[PDB]
Amino acid sequence: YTRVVWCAVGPEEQKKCQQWSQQSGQNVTCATASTTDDCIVLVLKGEADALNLDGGYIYTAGKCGLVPVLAENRKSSKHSSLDCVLRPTEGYLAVAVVKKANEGLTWNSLKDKKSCHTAVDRTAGWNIPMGLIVNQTGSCAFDEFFSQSCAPGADPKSRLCALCAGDDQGLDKCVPNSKEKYYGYTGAFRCLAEDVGDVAFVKNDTVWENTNGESTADWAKNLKREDFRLLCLDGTRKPVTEAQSCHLAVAPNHAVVSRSDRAAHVEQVLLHQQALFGKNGKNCPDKFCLFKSETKNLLFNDNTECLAKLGGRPTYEEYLGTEYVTAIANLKKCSLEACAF
Ligand SMILES: CCCCCCC/C=C\CCCCCC(=O)O[C@H](COC(=O)CCCCCC)CO[C@H]1O[C@H](CO)[C@@H](O)[C@H](O[C@@H]2O[C@H](C)[C@H](N)[C@H](O)[C@H]2NC(C)=O)[C@H]1O
Ligand SMILES: *[C@@H]1O[C@H](CO)[C@@H](O[C@@H]2O[C@H](CO)[C@@H](O[C@@H]3O[C@H](CO)[C@@H](O)[C@H](O)[C@@H]3O)[C@H](O)[C@H]2NC(C)=O)[C@H](O)[C@H]1NC(C)=O
Ligand SMILES: *[C@@H]1O[C@H](CO)[C@@H](O[C@@H]2O[C@H](CO)[C@@H](O)[C@H](O)[C@H]2NC(C)=O)[C@H](O)[C@H]1NC(C)=O
Ligand SMILES: [Fe+3]
Ligand SMILES: [Zn+2]
Ligand SMILES: [Zn+2]
């Protein structure tokens, strides 16, 4: 009776999920929704069991009673003796990236420029940068800071969606799923790489994984790290190698969430699923790899080494931390106690 229903966001994730479902022998089956919020609703209704969420979405799900179950864990440097599944998470660096050729663009001259965001409500793409901007300008009119943007999830007829391109046909403009060309970490970075936007709000890893031949994708194969600069909060610009000293915040890792009454069951299935399809899995790269999808980051981030257990059985507030949680609450005053559904 240990069957788990995963929630896929958009048709590309659905496709990957179906493959996983086939290989799992129906231990995992798939539900699909157009947006992450819709997937959250499916979980609440008990029509789906779980999905992997960015920190920003964990906050939404948390208010509605969903709980973190396992966290994405990437390549470490320390803790190297301890196993991946037991190793603590280090969190990723949220950064703002610009073209080197775009001289004189600093943090202090971002107003009226063109911005690329992963999606509304996400940590590096929205919550961190817009929280900082709202704070600095003392205004809730974050919708009027940049001249134009691609922020998937915003009103398709607003300036916040002006730069979004939609799918292979121009349909689904600004939808918060991989159908939108400039959606997510990869899409937001592509938005910058193609000079549609002036700045991209992504995490540190995105820059590295899509430059100097790390990505064989059409738009990325010719990109060089040296051609990019990170915007620091002190008004300086640094090479992408200096992320440790030039980031906007440290973000809590993406995590699997489920309804609390299903948490234990979801955990045991997943631990077994990754033994089969994880980084060193029995059937990866032979038959299926759960953490691969050609830089598209479908279901999970492509740089995920393993899903790790969470020390101290944390609530959603403890995981994201009190630092990050307070930032979100303040930004959400612009747009204390309620589930948003
Ligand atoms: C006071 C208000 C707190 C905020 C709200 C409550 C949060 C409650 C949970 C957080 C507990 C704090 C750290 C405990 C931890 O598990 O982590 C390290 C301990 O690891 C081990 O070796 C355990 C080995 C176990 C063997 C025994 C079986 C050391 O911690 C330090 O190093 C860790 C990796 O080297 C980072 O995870 C951690 O930061 C964390 O990194 C991420 C970036 C994320 N953004 C987190 O939000 C951040 N921490 C906080 C508190 O925000 C960092 O401070
Ligand atoms: C935008 O501005 C608000 C207002 O300052 C920032 O919220 C504030 O965040 C700090 C740190 O999270 C909170 O201060 C304190 O933290 C210490 C722990 O170090 C704690 O001991 C104190 O009780 C206190 O919370 C502060 O409470 C909080 N202020 C308010 C009014 O909620 C927010 O972080 C800023 N946004 C961004 C993205 O920086
Ligand atoms: C930013 O992210 C990049 C890529 O995720 C990190 O570079 C990787 O670091 C590991 C060891 O920590 C190396 O073994 C990998 O080969 C690197 N990946 C690539 C694609 O080059 C980098 O360490 C991160 N920077 C910070 C400051 O966290
Ligand atoms: Fe994220
Ligand atoms: Zn820092
Ligand atoms: Zn606790």
From Swiss-Prot:
Disulfide bonds: C7-C39, C17-C30, C64-C339, C84-C306, C116-C191, C140-C334, C150-C164, C161-C174, C232-C246, C284-C289
Positions bearing carbohydrate: N27, N135, N204
Binding residue positions for hydrogencarbonate 2: T118, R122, A124, G125
Residue intervals of the Transferrin-like domain: 4-333
Binding site for Fe(3+) 2: D54, Y92, Y185, H254
Stated role: Transferrins are iron binding transport proteins which can bind two Fe(3+) ions in association with the binding of an anion, usually bicarbonate. Lactoferricin binds to the bacterial surface and is crucial for the bactericidal functions. Has some antiviral activity against papillomavirus infection. N-terminal region shows strong antifungal activity against C.albicans. Contains two BBXB heparin-binding consensus sequences that appear to form the predominate functional GAG-binding site.
Annotated family: Belongs to the transferrin family.
Protein name per its UniProtKB record: Lactotransferrin
Organism name: Bos taurus (Bovine)
Residue range from the parent sequence: 361 to 705 of 708
